[PDB]
Amino acid sequence: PQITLWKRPLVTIKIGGQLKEALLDTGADDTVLEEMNLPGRWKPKMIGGIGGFIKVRQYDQILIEICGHKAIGTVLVGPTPVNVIGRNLLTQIGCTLNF
Amino acid sequence: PQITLWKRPLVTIKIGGQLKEALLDTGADDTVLEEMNLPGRWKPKMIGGIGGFIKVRQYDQILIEICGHKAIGTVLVGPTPVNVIGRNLLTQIGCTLNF
Numbered sequence: 628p629q630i631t632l633w634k635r636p637l638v639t640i641k642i643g644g645q646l647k648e649a650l651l652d653t654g655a656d657d658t659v660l661e662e663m664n665l666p667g668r669w670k671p672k673m674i675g676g677i678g679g680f681i682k683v684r685q686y687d688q689i690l691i692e693i694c695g696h697k698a699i700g701t702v703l704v705g706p707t708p709v710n711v712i713g714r715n716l717l718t719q720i721g722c723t724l725n726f
Numbered sequence: 727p728q729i730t731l732w733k734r735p736l737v738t739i740k741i742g743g744q745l746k747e748a749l750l751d752t753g754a755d756d757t758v759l760e761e762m763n764l765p766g767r768w769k770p771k772m773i774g775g776i777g778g779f780i781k782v783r784q785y786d787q788i789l790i791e792i793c794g795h796k797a798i799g800t801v802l803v804g805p806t807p808v809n810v811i812g813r814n815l816l817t818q819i820g821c822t823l824n825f
């Protein structure tokens with residue numbers, strides 16, 4: 628799809644078998660989701676944003692479907708204000724910026 | 727042009743008579759610029775992201791040139807670690823997400 632930016636680019640994602648809403652975020656290197664139960668092993672990490680740093684649970688090699696496009700990569704889980712899909716997964720679904 | 731997301735979507739901008747590097751950021755409602763001494767009136771604002779909130783100064787009807795594309799609108803100035811071009815200006819240069 629071609630997504631204009633007059634509205635927040637929110638899309639439906641599927642992760643851990645559960646549907647969620649997430650923001651396509653070209654300014655995010657990484658994908659950061661709100662607290663949730665995800666199966667598998669994880670390692671604690673720190674990520675920095677506009678307001679400082681937060682502790683997150685890093686899940687590697689996680690299957691995630693974004694608006695009908697499959698991706699498999701790293702998902703950070705922690706107290707983010709919004710579910711953000713970062714470039715690590717945007718590249719996998721072939722997402723580009725165009726003007 | 728078309729910008730892939732392998733690396734940060736950094737572009738050159740012109741604002742306040744200065745050239746700067748900034749992110750084309752679909753995850754930002756508004757444009758947020760690193761501290762700079764712009765003339766004119768402003769209004770205090772608080773914006774929140776990963777890590778919490780920062781205090782910024784809101785300037786209205788600021789002219790910004792993004793990759794040769796002219797735009798004019800709201801710019802938030804504060805202690806952000808990066809310059810981000812938000813949707814309020816991305817729409818004005820005809821920027822879309824595509825996959």
Ligand SMILES: CC(C)CN(C[C@@H](O)[C@H](Cc1ccccc1)NC(=O)O[C@H]1CO[C@H]2OCC[C@H]21)S(=O)(=O)c1ccc([C@@H](O)CO)cc1
Nearest residue numbers: 654655656657675676677709753754755756773774775776
């Ligand atoms: C979290 C989003 C919902 C919101 N943010 C936009 C994001 O793109 C942000 C940009 C960014 C990139 C590098 C350093 C600091 C900030 N990226 C980010 O935090 O990424 C994290 C995860 O991956 C890593 O890579 C970079 C950092 C790590 S925000 O800047 O905080 C923000 C909040 C409110 C407004 C108002 O206009 C209302 O929207 C406008 C902008």
